[PDB]
Design a protein around this ligand. Structure first.
Ligand SMILES: Cc1cc2nc3c(=O)[nH]c(=O)nc-3n(C[C@H](O)[C@H](O)[C@H](O)COP(=O)(O)OP(=O)(O)OC[C@H]3O[C@@H](n4cnc5c(N)ncnc54)[C@H](O)[C@@H]3O)c2cc1C
Ligand SMILES: Cc1cc2nc3c(=O)[nH]c(=O)nc-3n(C[C@H](O)[C@H](O)[C@H](O)COP(=O)(O)OP(=O)(O)OC[C@H]3O[C@@H](n4cnc5c(N)ncnc54)[C@H](O)[C@@H]3O)c2cc1C
Lengths: 376, 369
């Protein structure tokens, strides 16, 4: 069943995504035809139940979706990850019956979800927010600025975190609500198909019915998806590494210098074998961490395994992309091949859903006792 | 004196290059104003003797010039390296007196030199050329296609290698000669201020006096500049690494999260100190290799030292840029800071002037026999 699912996403990514990747990366756009296909074929609703217009599939199927998309286009995979894992997944866990019936069919059919937590001064210290939802009759008036919102220029629904007068609180806010605007602000090095924007709120009206969970319950809402967010990026990094390794292996069989294929030199072959070995271990850890979901496994152990999976997969993605650029020589430094894009894309995996240091802080803290804040 | 030279290039790079780097990288252009300043301030003639209109400086000063330019813009540094080291430097050391007297003043004053050796099927196997110089009355007709020519869209003079009906042979060819055209062909990841093109020759006429050395002398002309080429790129990598470390150290002191500067954490400070240590060793090896030039040193020992300096410096540049991107977090992934450009630029250093595997093969061959 999961072999058939893998093959279906692989075929989709190779036929529908690959021919558009170079242009989506240069222009930082999501192709309109591809967007219609992502929704139609179920890549935007993998775990959303059938009763809300979703695929009704498993965490395993969602992880395989992100992996096989990422194998061809890590940038498209960011949008798929944010939408399914962070936005639809948060509503499946925390939204009321009414909120699920209102938003899940939209996310399953045609409305893209983006996740707006970070700010200029709230990065690793993610809840040092200055965006405020001020009380009003019937709900709130939202004012502030979010930074690094992936897929913002393509999004219809924002899951936004703001101080309720009261502590961090989660809201669902339409991207076209009064007082909402975007500032693309900067060029980013990779995952450009889902490039970030700043999101600006200028007294945007939000009804009480848009609040997800209680006032000051924003950190609990975010924390429930932390582990799953890290597995989704571990899957994106595993797929990226596979795509890099597939390009380098195939090239090494056909490029000839000095009268024979470059694969016949141990200086070319050995780095590929080393990457392949590390990638088999990264994938085994990812699928182990996924398998231990829905088993009543200790939550701390799940947090540990998700942080370790993302840390290891990120490392292997960097190594794979690096080795792949070098295996291809000058061609590997160009857009004629995908490996320079994979190299630019891989670096985003060390920054979002927990920087390397934030992951190691968490992991060490579980192993030696104390909290992450005790480690200097 | 070298301390004064270093500060003069540093000041130049921070004032005249830094404000243009972002634009030059996105558009893959050399700014016209900057181009005039490179010639006027002597960066395009560092070791060309004053008798040709040059600066009259030393190899040590040329190496420092490449390093300080690369600390701000590794892409502009490619163009400076290829012009001074591979084109003007090769003519100074191998061309006839008439060729030196004709071409060095033009390279000193306004004509950019580029170096056209590589082809689609001639990469690491650099001499498996298919471009041909066919004999004709009073010279040759060149036909073929070169690949990976840095700075080609800005160049006025090309040092071109071709099979003379004799083996590989070197020619000086004007970029506007009959039958010469460029094909940019692809988008490259970095060093984009000096982005490559293909150079196409369609029966380009060359006179005998444009040939540098004898027919079949092209390897000798190319290999003779391989050592100095590797030192130039070692300087480019060392400079890139410094620029990355400068941005990361400066940022670590001003970015606060969790109520203090990120430099107060060992997970941020240690990687910067590790990079700083490895860069101090890469720079010491570079300046050792440079110091042993112009002294009658065993040529094999100079080739070993140049290969090792480039290999080590390349590796430090990769670690420095990688650490700098992650030190800056999201900001490091964006063009608001120079470190993502450094990260894209650094990877070029592992490919040109000898790939990592070609350097290790050369070093092992010397050490093992
Ligand atoms: C391409 C991209 C996509 C993104 N997508 C989204 C998204 O869609 N929505 C969203 O809300 N956010 C998103 N983010 C933001 C992302 O979560 C943050 O960039 C990340 O949390 C790091 O914060 P920062 O950039 O402010 O870096 P900082 O927190 O400033 O970190 C800078 C450096 O200091 C280190 N550091 C910080 N504190 C410590 C410590 N205590 N000990 C050790 N080292 C420390 C970090 O590890 C890093 O090396 C995205 C970011 C990028 C680059
Ligand atoms: C940005 C850029 C600028 C350049 N500038 C110039 C320039 O201005 N002028 C110019 O003439 N050239 C230039 N080059 C060309 C450059 O010199 C070549 O790209 C380089 O020589 C490698 O050749 P290739 O790209 O054909 O790779 P290949 O030679 O195909 O190598 C592919 C891979 O195989 C490995 N390999 C090959 N043979 C062996 C072996 N025997 N043992 C072990 N491993 C092996 C290589 O190390 C590499 O990892 C430039 C290249 C780039 C990317």
């Amino acid at each position: 069943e999961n072999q058939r699912w893998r093959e279906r996403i692989r075929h989709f990514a190779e036929k529908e995504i690959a021919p558009l990747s170079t242009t989506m990366d240069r222009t930082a756009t999501l192709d309109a035809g591809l967007r219609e296909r992502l929704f139609a074929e179920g890549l935007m609703s993998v775990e959303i139940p059938r009763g809300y217009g979703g695929t009704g599939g498993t965490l395993c199927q969602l992880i395989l979706t992100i992996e096989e998309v990422a194998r061809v286009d890590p940038g498209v995979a960011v949008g798929v990850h944010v939408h399914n894992v962070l936005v639809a997944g948060t509503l499946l866990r925390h939204a009321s019956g009414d909120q699920r019936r209102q938003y899940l069919p939209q996310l399953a059919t045609g409305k893209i979800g983006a996740f707006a937590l970070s700010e200029e001064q709230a990065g690793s210290d993610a809840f040092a927010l200055t965006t405020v939802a001020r009380q009003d009759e019937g709900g709130y008036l939202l004012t502030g600025r979010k930074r690094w919102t992936s897929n913002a220029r393509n999004a219809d629904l924002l899951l936004v975190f703001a101080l309720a007068d009261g502590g961090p609180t989660a809201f669902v806010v339409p991207a076209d609500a009064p007082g909402v605007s975007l500032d693309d602000r900067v060029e980013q090095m990779g995952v450009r198909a889902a490039a970030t924007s700043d999101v600006i709120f200028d007294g945007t009206p939000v009804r009480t019915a848009q609040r997800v969970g209680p006032p000051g319950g924003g950190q609990t809402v975010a924390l429930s998806g932390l582990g799953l967010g890290r597995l989704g990026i571990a899957a994106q990094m595993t797929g990226l590494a596979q795509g890099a390794l597939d390009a380098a292996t195939g090239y090494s069989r056909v490029r000839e210098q000095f009268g024979g294929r470059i694969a016949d030199h141990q200086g070319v072959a050995f780095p590929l074998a080393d990457v392949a070995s590390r990638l088999a271990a990264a994938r085994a850890l990812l699928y182990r961490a996924v398998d231990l979901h829905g088993r009543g496994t200790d939550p701390v152990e799940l947090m540990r395994l998700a942080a370790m999976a993302k840390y290891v997969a990120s490392e292997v993605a960097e190594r794979a992309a690096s080795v792949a650029v070098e295996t291809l020589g000058g061609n590997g430094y160009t857009d004629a091949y995908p490996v320079e894009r994979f190299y630019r894309d891989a670096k985003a995996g060390k920054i979002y859903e927990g920087t390397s240091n934030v992951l190691l802080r968490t992991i060490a803290s579980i192993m030696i006792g104390g909290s992450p804040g005790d480690l200097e």
